[PDB]
Design a binder for this molecule. Structure first.
Ligand SMILES: CCOC(=O)[C@H](CCCNC(=N)N)NC(=O)c1ccccc1
Ligand SMILES: N=C(N)NCCC[C@@H](NC(=O)c1ccccc1)C(=O)O
Ligand SMILES: NC(=[NH2+])NCCC[C@H](N)C(=O)O
Ligand SMILES: [Ca+2]
Ligand SMILES: [Cl-]
Ligand SMILES: [Cl-]
Ligand SMILES: [Cl-]
Length: 223
């Protein structure tokens, strides 16, 4: 996250970390057993870390649970990043508390102009590399499908939306992928892609979760 702020410890209770010996992606807890992340975050033997603030220090609110299933969208395209969504089933159910909770799925697509909260342990620098210990937070509005397509001609599918600032200065970045975009109390986005971070006319591009609600519910029911 570039141009964000320190969330505060366990102030994003749905924010998880996907660890393969190290943090490489975010994810969103949507119920006791299931996480939504980005398809491009797929890898074998994922450990899910919940109740994290400082991802490099044990603070005592963590739950560490192995992924038993990692299910990439059937039409995920690694080149276009179309359908950049994955479901992870937890080997056991997370314990509900003030610090570890699910975020609700959308019932509708949110409107351009709606404010969203974007969170993660990704790069905080648009030039060079700095990884924060503690979770960073950004407030960023959904941008018009029109200004998104203007920024990324020939690249924005109906499964993608832009959020942020056409002037740049605030964005998601490398290591935020799979993390939540939460608008009007609902999970509307997954951190997917962008050209650089926080650059002018180059806002973050997010998986449009409202298109996947029926696939998510069917996957959960079957598995
Ligand atoms: C695991 C690393 O992936 C990520 O977190 C990022 C997220 C990008 C956010 N960028 C914004 N401008 N908001 N994804 C990639 O890397 C990417 C690749 C190639 C091209 C673009 C992104
Ligand atoms: N399908 C199940 N077997 N579930 C058991 C729930 C146990 C546990 N978890 C939550 O209720 C929870 C829900 C959302 C987010 C985090 C936890 C509890 O009893 O604490
Ligand atoms: N527009 C915002 N995102 N405001 C929140 C920034 C952080 C908050 N003002 C604080 O003192 O910790
Ligand atoms: Ca920790
Ligand atoms: Cl709708
Ligand atoms: Cl629009
Ligand atoms: Cl176009």
């Amino acid at each position: 996250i570039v141009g964000g702020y320190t969330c505060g410890a366990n102030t994003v209770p749905y924010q998880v970390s996907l660890n393969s010996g190290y943090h490489f992606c975010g994810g969103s807890l949507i119920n006791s057993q299931w996480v939504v992340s980005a398809a491009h975050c797929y890898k074998s033997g994922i450990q899910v870390r919940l109740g994290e603030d400082n991802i490099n220090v044990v603070e005592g609110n963590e739950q560490f649970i192995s992924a038993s299933k990692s299910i990439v969208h059937p039409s995920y395209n690694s080149n276009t990043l179309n359908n950049d969504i994955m479901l992870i089933k937890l080997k056991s159910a997370a314990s509900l508390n003030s610090r570890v909770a699910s975020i609700s799925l959308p019932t509708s697509c949110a409107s351009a102009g709606t404010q969203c909260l974007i969170s993660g342990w990704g790069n905080t620098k648009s030039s060079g590399t700095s990884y924060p210990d503690v979770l960073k937070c950004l407030k960023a509005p959904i941008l018009s499908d029109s200004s998104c397509k203007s920024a990324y001609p020939g690249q924005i599918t109906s499964n993608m939306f832009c959020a942020g600032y056409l002037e740049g200065g605030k964005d998601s970045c490398q290591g935020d992928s799979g993390g939540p975009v939460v608008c009007s109390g609902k999970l509307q986005g997954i951190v997917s892609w962008g050209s650089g971070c926080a650059q002018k006319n180059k806002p973050g591009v997010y998986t449009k979760v409202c298109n996947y609600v029926s696939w998510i519910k069917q996957t959960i029911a079957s598995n």
